[PDB]
Structure formats: C-alpha cells, structure tokens
Symmetry: C2
Subunit: 114 residues, 2 copies
C-alpha cells in the first residue's frame, strides 16, 4: 500500500534482556497519523502496543509494555524503531510495524527465554 | 482479561450513512493507556483505527477514517463508542473494541452497500 515497510531485528534473548526492531520505509511516512508496532502471540489476536501520533509526535504505549519499550523514528533514514528493554517470556510473539497508508512490515519473531 | 467488553451495534447501511458501535465494560477502564477500535476486513490483518490515549484523553485516528469516525467514552456508563459517519463500501469489516488490560469485544459486522 503506497509506502512499503521492510522489517528487521528480533531473535532470542534472555528475560531481562533487550532487542531492537527496525522498519525501513520506501519513502517518507512522518505524515501518517499513526506509525505503530503491533504484537501477535500464537493463539491471540494482533494488537497495537506502541505508536507515534502523526503530527504532534506524541507517543502511546499499551499498559503491557509502557516503561519497557520505546518507539522512535528517523526521517533522514525513514526508519521506525522499537527498542525493547526488560524483556519477559510473555513478550514472546511476532511483531509487525504499520503506518497509516503504508503496507504491513513482514512479521518478526521475538522469543524470550526463562 | 480483568475488564470484560460487551460489544453491540453495526448492521447494514448505504454509502454515506452512519452507524454507531458501543462497547460496555464490566468496570472502569479510563485508567487504560489505550482505549481503541480495531478493523478487520475479510482477507486482511486487524488494524487499529481509532483510540483514546489513557491519561490526557487525546485521540488518534488512522488516515483511512479521520474526519469521518469519532471515538468517545462515558465513564458513568463505562461505555466506549465509535460513531461512524460517511460510510464507504471500503469500511465493510468486522470491528472490535479493546482497552489496555481488558478482554477483546466480540467482533461486529458493518456492511456498507453501494
């Protein structure tokens, strides 16, 4: 859908650890009302966990990740980031990026061991 | 998940028309960082379209619905609403409500005819 998102990052980390996800866009997307990261656990619905609101640049985080995850965006490189800190086994899921009008990032796996 | 959401509303409407969706919670949820409505078209991923950010009460809308849809919340009744105006065939989808820490609303169908 117009702007394409190439997702990278993820892997396997111990609880308490950190991982960063990246989402490189094919063009500018700072004009999107919503620039977000979504989480989908195995038998669960996909759900938004972090977003930048296109315009005032304010952020929103779901209670489950607030204070541990941080969403940022670099308009020089046209990259949206998700810095995950203090990871927990419950954060194990496929992660997707999406912006208003853009296509979805391909899902990445994040696995958090005991 | 702690607070339960009972979804109601939807139906069939002509393009240009209006419908309201409601989501009655089992308890207070104004403390949720995210109070939102999500859209899932038949062969597509679920996606957030409108949210109230728990705290400052500011809103965010995906570009696809901004200026046509409005999200509101009544803390006396503990109901989250989505007022949909100027409906288009492309808005045809299953709609779900969700708040941080709450369970998902059961999906409702909204069908917009020619």
């Amino acid at each position: 859908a117009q702007v394409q998102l190439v997702e990278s990052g993820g892997g396997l980390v111990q609880a308490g650890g950190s991982l960063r996800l990246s989402c490189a866009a094919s063009g500018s997307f700072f004009m999107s009302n919503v620039m977000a990261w979504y989480r989908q656990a195995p038998g669960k619905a996909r759900e938004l966990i972090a977003a930048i609101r296109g315009g005032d640049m304010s952020t929103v985080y779901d209670d489950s990740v607030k204070g541990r995850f941080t969403i940022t965006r670099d308009d020089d490189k046209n990259i949206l980031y998700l810095q995950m800190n203090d990871l927990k086994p419950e954060d194990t899921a496929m992660y997707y990026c999406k912006a208003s009008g853009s296509s979805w990032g391909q899902g990445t796996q994040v696995t958090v061991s005991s």
